[PDB]
Amino acid sequence: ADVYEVEDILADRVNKNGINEYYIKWAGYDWYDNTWEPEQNLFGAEKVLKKWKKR
């Protein structure tokens, strides 16, 4: 439903709850649509997340 394709992860931060959030480039959406998402929202994006974490 509110689920979209991830093009890439661009940055990360820890919020106030100590949860990692990731700055997402959404495939097919322009850079003004980028959003910070908590780690759980990346359930469908295992490969790009692990690449981001290892780099």
């Binding site: 394709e5 998402e37 469908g44």
Partner: peptide, 7 residues
Amino acid sequence: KQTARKS
């Protein structure tokens, strides 16, 4: 194909 929930 990578998917995620967008707030």
